[PDB]
Amino acid sequence: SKTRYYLEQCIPEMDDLVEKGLFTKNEVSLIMKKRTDFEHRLNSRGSSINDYIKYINYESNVNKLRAKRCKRILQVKKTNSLSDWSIQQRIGFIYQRGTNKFPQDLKFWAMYLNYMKARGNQTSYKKIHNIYNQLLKLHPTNVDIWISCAKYEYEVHANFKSCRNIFQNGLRFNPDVPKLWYEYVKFELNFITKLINRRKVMGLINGDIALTIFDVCMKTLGKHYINKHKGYYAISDSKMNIELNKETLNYLFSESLRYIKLFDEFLDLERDYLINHVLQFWKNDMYDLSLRKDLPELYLKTVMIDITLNIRYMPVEKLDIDQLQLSVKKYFAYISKLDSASVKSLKNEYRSYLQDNYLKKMNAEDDPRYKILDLIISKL
């Protein structure tokens, strides 16, 4: 049987434990009896992943118990013999057998990866790559795996070359997931901020790339969203097709707004320049729908970001009157082209923005600018 072969592989380890004096023969017998039940459990029918989890948990405690008797009895940190790595080798083997038997369980894969990453010295990083290669092939459509190895090789390794290739391959399999685009762009700018800081660090001691990802993201996400909500067929009625166009604009708009929030985090990059690219993107008519005509509510938000763009990142201390005038000059420009209902709502939002960010944070009696802000707010 398979069990007898695996039990006999434990014998050289147990001969070592008795020989070193850490475990008595009676104690060694008790460990084998417990191991015998597990190995029979794994090699039989009806086995579940919990059996593998239980056996791995048991082996870990045996490793701990041997470790403490090693310091208590032998009084040595490491006894150069088979007993040291026999348990660790075994636990890895249980992980391999369980993963092959039950590839569907993603939790077990995570435990396997955490276990092998934890003992970095014992396990070469090359072995970690093999686990990810086999896992990725089985589940190409789980983005969390793709980001995990990308994150692992950006933090533990910091190989942007391999990490970039992971995002390149991951998006190839899952172009319809906004989440993977969000992380790849986050990685892309993360590579830039780290790079510029190195240049800044270099000086003392002596963004478009993300936008392209954003642009292709918005096109690709649109195509798949249209394919979904249509089923096997196209939609014959014209009105329904218009609605499907409206949904993707809103769905794509929410994605674009989510990227807008991401840019704010990055002080080093020229966020105003990066945001303006997004605003320019939405100016172009898309899917035969105009934002100003068909989706005004999205348009007002599009206008509002443009109005505050020059003053969005200006602290109250460095508030320049001329730049505020440019914002107000932009404010009057859009009103001349907007309807009354839109102007009122747009007026309310802009007034609240100025009041909350600048007026409420400024002392009234110390700064002449406070009077100017109130006059503008009153006139707005």
* C-alpha Rg value of the chain to the nearest Å: 31
- Closest to RNA by CB, 24 vs 122, is 122
Site for RNA contains 273 (CB under 7 A) = no
Query: With respect to RNA, which residue has the nearer C-beta, 89 or 325?
Result: 89
Query: Least distance in Å: CB of 191 to RNA?
Result: 17
Q: Which long-range contacts (CB under 8 A, 24 or more apart) does 214-220 make?
A: 214/181, 214/185, 214/256, 214/259, 214/277, 214/278, 215/281, 217/178, 217/181, 217/185, 217/255, 218/252, 218/255, 218/256, 218/281, 220/175, 220/176
Of 49, 60, 85, 370, the one binding RNA (CB under 7 A) is: 85
89 lies in the binding site for RNA (CB under 7 A): yes
- Determine if 68 is a binding residue for RNA (CB under 7 A): no
Residues in binding contact with RNA, number by CB under 7 A: 42
Nearest distance, CB of residue 169 and RNA, angstroms: 12
Binding to RNA, residues 146-165 (CB under 7 A): 161
Among the listed residues 353, 351, 343, the one whose alpha carbon sits nearest the alpha carbon of residue 375 = 351
Euclidean distance between CA atoms 187 and 172, whole angstroms: 17
Pick the binder of RNA from 30, 73, 76, 364 (CB under 7 A): 76
CB nearer RNA, residue 33 or residue 77: 77
Task: Name the residue among 125, 98, 123 with its Cα closest to residue 110.
Answer: 98
Question: Smaller CB distance to RNA: residue 125 or 273?
Answer: 125
289 in Cβ contact with 246 (< 8 Å):
yes
CB of 294 to RNA, least distance (A): 47
Task: Please give the residues from 13 up to 52 whose contact with RNA meets the rule CB under 7 A.
Answer: 16, 45-47
Q: Which is nearer to RNA, 39 or 306 (CB)?
A: 39
- Contact between 290 and RNA by CB under 7 A: the answer reads no
Letters for 110-149 (x = contact with RNA by CB under 7 A, - = none) are --------xxxxxxxxxx-xx--x----------------
Measured in degrees and rounded to the nearest 5, phi and psi for residue 285 equal: -65, 135
Task: State the number of CA atoms in the 13 A half-sphere of 183 facing the CB.
Answer: 22
Shortest spacing between CB 78 and RNA, in angstroms: 5
> Is residue 100 part of the contact set for RNA (CB under 7 A)?
yes
Q: How far is the CB of 163 from RNA (least distance, A)?
A: 12
d(Cα 24, Cα 29) in Å, to the nearest integer? 9
Give me the sign of the Cα torsion angle 174, 178, 184, 188: positive
Instruction: Give the CA angle between residues 7, 12, 15 to the nearest 5°.
Output: 110
Q: Is residue 205 within the footprint of RNA (CB under 7 A)?
A: no
Decide: is 92 part of the binding site for RNA (CB under 7 A).
Answer: yes
| Residue number with CB closer to RNA (5 or 273) | 5
Determine the 3-state secondary structure of 332 from DSSP.
Answer: helix
Considering the complex, state which of residue 94 and residue 319 has its C-beta at the smaller distance from RNA: 94
User: Is residue 149 within 8 Å of residue 116, measured between CB atoms?
Assistant: no
Among positions 20, 41, 54, 101, the unique one binding RNA when judged by CB under 7 A:
101
DSSP, residue by residue, 202-239: HHHH--HHHHHHHHHHHHHHHHHHHHTTSTTS---SHH
Binding string, 338-377, against RNA, x = CB under 7 A? ----------------------------------------
Instruction: Give whichever of 45 and 261 is closer to RNA, judged by the CB atom.
Output: 45
SS (H, E, C) 113-168: HHHHHHCCCCCCHHHHHHHHHHHHHHCCCCHHHHHHHHHHHHHCCCCHHHHHHHHH
Judged by CB under 7 A, which of 36, 60, 63, 88 binds RNA?
88
Find, among 66, 43, 39, the residue nearest to 55 by Cα: 39
Q: Residue numbers of the site for RNA (CB under 7 A)?
A: 1-2, 5-6, 9-10, 12, 16, 45-47, 76-78, 80-82, 84-86, 88-90, 92-93, 96, 100-101, 118-127, 129-130, 133, 161
